[PDB]
Design a protein around this ligand. Structure first.
Ligand SMILES: NC(=O)c1ccc[n+]([C@@H]2O[C@H](COP(=O)([O-])OP(=O)(O)OC[C@H]3O[C@@H](n4cnc5c(N)ncnc54)[C@H](OP(=O)(O)O)[C@@H]3O)[C@@H](O)[C@H]2O)c1
Length: 316
């Protein structure tokens, strides 16, 4: 298992990164410091997470300490839905750069294909409770992303939560200048994503798997829902390999040529989650894990199903 995957912009991306959604602002600085100390070189961020300043404090301190050099880090962030207008994209990127206290991002993603009305609210609502869309299309937002590469603000651009028709729409864009480097999508044994992964990989787009542990801290979790970390079938594979269930869940996407971004703010788990370069799942283990697919999503953007660009009505 090599530590980095080559992107279609010519740069290498670490296959294991630290997620930061829901990492409390008073804990995430130490989490990122610990992560860098124990080997992580890739941090997955987003403006909508509201903690980029605190992530940035950690990055800056570890650079100052010379634990790592900037060239060795791979920092990812994402353009929120209220910034899809072409004229808002640069400033959104620059706010993230300023908060993360970086001069460039390694990768900047369109967070979702759905654009929303700009303004202070991340989910602007009409009086009837619906999320108000923007009229800016997926292709115009991509052209604005391309400009960021040409201005030196970002080394790579990509997409997130795009279905294959939406990926295809970008690939088929008239005058396309840069292909997406990455599509970051939810992926785990209950949402195995075979069709969309194969499509993206066939086009040279690297896939990053989010919520690889099934996001047991997601805000909308119910009692009722399936639980990867507690699934006896997965626990048995882990026991066979003398690893934790989380370590199996992280190794699984790695062996599919995916990047994976487990989140933790717990120092012991941050270290555990990195210790996934010391064992191999068999092909039979891999097929067995794939067999658990349920089409179950942590992140279904349920408030936005009427949006024209909602991604999850299409089969993939
Ligand atoms: N592009 C998108 O739209 C999108 C959407 C969702 C997620 N993401 C990205 O993907 C990252 C990961 O997904 P996620 O945050 O939804 O969930 P996740 O990584 O699947 O699960 C995180 C949860 O698992 C716990 N955990 C971590 N390591 C563990 C271990 N070894 N043993 C037991 N429990 C463990 C964490 O607890 P503690 O933190 O308390 O240790 C936290 O409650 C996000 O943080 C974000 O960076 C992106």
């Amino acid at each position: 298992m090599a530590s980095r995957i080559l992107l279609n912009n010519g740069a290498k991306m670490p296959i294991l990164g630290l997620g930061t959604w829901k990492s409390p602002p008073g804990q995430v600085t130490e989490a990122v410091k610990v992560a860098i100390d124990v080997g992580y070189r890739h941090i997955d961020c987003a403006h909508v997470y509201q903690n980029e300043n605190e992530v940035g404090v950690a990055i800056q301190e570890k650079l100052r300490e010379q634990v790592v050099k900037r060239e060795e880090l791979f920092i990812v962030s994402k353009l929120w839905c209220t910034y899809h207008e072409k004229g808002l994209v640069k400033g959104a990127c620059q706010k993230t750069l300023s908060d993360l206290k970086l001069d460039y991002l390694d990768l900047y993603l369109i967070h979702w294909p759905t654009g929303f009305k700009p303004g202070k609210e991340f989910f602007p609502l009409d009086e009837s409770g619906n999320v108000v869309p923007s009229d800016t299309n997926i292709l115009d937002t991509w052209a604005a992303m391309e400009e960021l590469v040409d201005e030196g603000l970002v080394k790579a651009i990509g997409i997130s939560n795009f279905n294959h028709l939406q990926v295809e729409m970008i690939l088929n864009k008239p005058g396309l200048k840069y292909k997406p480097a990455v599509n970051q999508i939810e992926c785990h044994p209950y949402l195995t994503q075979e069709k969309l992964i194969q499509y993206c990989q066939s086009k040279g787009i690297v896939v990053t798997a989010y919520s690889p542990l099934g996001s047991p801290d997601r805000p909308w979790a119910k009692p009722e829902d399936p639980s990867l970390l507690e699934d006896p079938r997965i626990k048995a594979i882990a026991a066979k390999h003398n690893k934790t269930t989380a370590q199996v869940l992280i190794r699984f996407p790695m062996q599919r040529n995916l990047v994976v971004i487990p989140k933790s703010v717990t120092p012991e788990r941050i270290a555990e989650n990195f210790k996934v370069f010391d064992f191999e799942l068999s092909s039979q283990d891999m097929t067995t894990l794939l067999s658990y697919n349920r089409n179950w999503r942590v992140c279904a953007l349920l408030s936005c199903t009427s949006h024209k660009d909602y991604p999850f009505h299409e089969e993939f």
